[model samples]
Target: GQSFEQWRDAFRQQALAGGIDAQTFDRAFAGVQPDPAVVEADRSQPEFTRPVWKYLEGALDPLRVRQGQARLAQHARILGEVDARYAVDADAVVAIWGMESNYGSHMGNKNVIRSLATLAYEGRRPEFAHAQLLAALKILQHGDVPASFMIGSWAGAMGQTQFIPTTHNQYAVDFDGDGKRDIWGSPGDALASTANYLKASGWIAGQPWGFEVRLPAGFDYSLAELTIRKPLGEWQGMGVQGVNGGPLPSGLSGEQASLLLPAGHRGPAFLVLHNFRAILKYNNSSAYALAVGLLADSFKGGGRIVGAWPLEDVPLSRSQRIELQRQLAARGHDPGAVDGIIGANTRKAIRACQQEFGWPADGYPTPALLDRLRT
Candidate 1:
């Protein structure tokens, strides 16, 4: 194992060769040490995933909704301009602002350079850390933010919208025409950059991201996968209805949608459109995308979710999740991987297993399900 100084010196050569000037590199690393805290945070993952309802409750609390609405009104001019320019809805952009950094209230305070450098030197995910570090150095070179002031989260997600260095490099915009993409200070830059990123990710100008829906009893859970896209007409024929007990949005009958049971059948159901996928491009978690959609709706005086979440459902531990995946794969239901994360493939596999067992087929995993699978 090389000392921190040795590693720093070795990486300095590579950084300089990669077009990072010596003075910039030196100043960026000045008094920087290998932060044990960053490494510790990096290595830690929750034993069990947080419940979807818990996350949504915090994300869509009444105070947050009021604040989000206030922010939308406060920034209406810039948000409207961004919408006119990028064709991404102003509500969605504002929702992202609220989600990523609480409307710029907590865009992290860690020094980006030090955090990236520590992660790079720690070597757990050296490749990712290296790429981010390089881009961060380039950001310094471009003079968008000074090294001393380039603060972000420990993972190096910078700015009001929590963009990683590379994402910021690719999608950040100078909407305020300040000659710099100052996402940390300029709400216009942050919101516009977010809009630009969504547009790049295939945001449909006129389509809604999705809305909570009511599913008919005994609905086939296998059809709930994001991969299983069907036209709204097809879904309506299959007994899907709007949350308000009305017909599915008639205007979007021709658009393709995917049925989502984020907390299984006992909880909220949504008919997510192509724009929901665009939100996923910003942050991959289904929970996160759902929160963004719901929050966006709230900003526009839309009603809160009417369906109750399954509060009694306990989240499976990571080990139990891996075991569940293994059981599914062993029984000829392909869970894609044995990783602890319960993604779409794993949920599909769970539904398949549930069908074989003559269960409700909601695709949600529980300790009871694991016990039966083991037996």
Candidate 2:
């Protein structure tokens, strides 16, 4: 493997070849350190390890929902304007706001330039990260934002909507018309930029994002295939009724939809549509997209999911999981130094402890297990 210096030099040359100016490359690459910890954490993220209930606990917390509602009211004008211009729903934008960065409270604290440069230098997704780094430099060159304010997620995502540099280059807008695309503190720019991204990604006006429906008795879940696109009328004719037992919304005729069983066979079901796919363009995860959609619905005063989340099994509290990490470290099992977010290191440690104590080592941490460990 090439060293970080080699990668950085190579990417700088590539950027110049791609027509990026030398000054831009120099500024972006100057004194940037490769965050080995971020790389390690990214590599160890528990993409498929957590149970759905456990995941939802963090995704659908009451605080987020309440904050989303408040933010909707606060930014009602811009959100409404974005909805009108982009044909995406305002509630969806608000939900996305809540989900992406806690309604703009925590867009991330990492330096965008440093993170992208580090990722590019580290050679993981170098091509992609290099391109993004160039875009970040371009943003800086264009004076769209100051370097101090261009901070974001570990992956170089910036601003209130958490847009990566590439996405920012492609979709960021000057909603405030201040001659710059400021997504950091400007709600107008952030919300409008989000709407623009969705619109450009094929968000259809007046189309419902999706609908909640009751699964019929003995409905062959295997037939729960993602296929099938027809008019809402046609779906109604085929016995697919809304959760409220009412007719599907109007003007959505002939739109194909996929039957979404978010938590496999046990959780809530949705008839997701093309607009939902558009939303997914913002974030690739189904659970994330669904949470955004559902939060939007709640913002519109829509009720909760008719069915309960399957939570009868063990559940882990955030603090309890943190405590578990503390215990693991106390025992000299360095679970990569816990930060209390229940990522891979903590899960691996939990599994090891479970095995040593004759418990099931399913790699899940729960409140009960934490208490047991404490004793």
Candidate 3:
């Protein structure tokens, strides 16, 4: 095994060949070392996976809503300009700001270059890390932000809006007429850049992300997957309605949406439309997209979810999830990878298991499911 110094020194040559000049590379690496803490974070999986409701509880906290509202008003002048230019809603942009860095109060304090260099040397995903390191260096070379100010998450997500280096190069804007695209200290630049990214990611101007609705009794839960998209008129024919017992919201009859019951059939259901998928481009998690939509709505004085959460549900630990997947695969239901993450394949496996167990195939995993699987 090559020493870290040896590896880093050797990597320097690769950086030079990739068009990063020697002075910029040297400055970026002046005090860099492989961060053991970052490596540990990359390898460790937490024992308990928070259920979707639990995650939304923190993400859509009332405090976050109130803070988001305040910031929306505080920055309305700049945000309005961003909205007019990008055709992205200010509330949605502010909601992302609230989510990513808590309205810029707590952007991570790690040094990005050192963190990425550490990840590159660690080699878990060196190629991706290597590309990101080059992008970060290019941002420095372009004078977007200097080394002293280039701080972010341990994974190299930088700025108040948390654009990974490559994304920053592509979408970040200098909206305040500044000579530099300074996302770290300029709220205008950060928020505008966020709006620009969303616009580029298929954000539909003036369309609601989605709304909570009541599903018809005995509605097929299997149709709830994000992939099974259907137009609003078809859902209306199937008796989907607003949570308050009215028709599905007006003005979306032509738009397509996918049904989602994040907390299973007993909880609130949503017909997430195009804007919701647009948010998903920013962060892939369904729960995260839902939180962004709900938080943005809350900023506009929207009401709470009408349906009750499944409070008795306890989520499985990562190890339990892996065992659950294994058990399903043994029963001829493939969960794709045996890793703990519950993506579409794992959810499909869970649905099959639920159907076999004579339960509703809502595809949600719980502690009780694990116990039944163990036997």
lDDT of 3 by residue, 289-358 (tens): 9999999999988837998888875778888888889988998889998998888899999999989998
Across residues 1-375, which tens digit of lDDT does each residue of candidate 1 receive?
278888889988889889999998998999998877889889987687578888888998889899988998888899889999999998899888889999999988899989998899885898999999999998888887788888888899998989999999999998977688888889999999999999999998868899888888778877878888999999999999989787988789999999888777788889999999999999998889999998988877873888987867777888889889999999999999688888878988998899999987877888778999888
User: lDDT: which is higher, 2 or 3?
Assistant: 3
In model 2, where is the ten-residue run with the lowest total lDDT? 220-229
Against the correct fold, how does model 3 do in TM-score?
A: 0.97
Give the higher-TM-score candidate: 1 or 2. 1
lDDT of 2 by residue, 76-129 (tens): 888888888777778777777778888789988888888887777674677877
lDDT of 3: 0.89
Alpha-carbon RMSD to native, per candidate: 1.7, 9.0, 1.3
Clashes in predicted model 2:
2
Q: Candidate 1 local accuracy as lDDT?
A: 0.88
Q: Which stretches of candidate 2 lie over 4 Å from their true place?
A: 1-3, 45-48, 244-246, 312-375
Residue 290 lDDT in candidate 1: 91
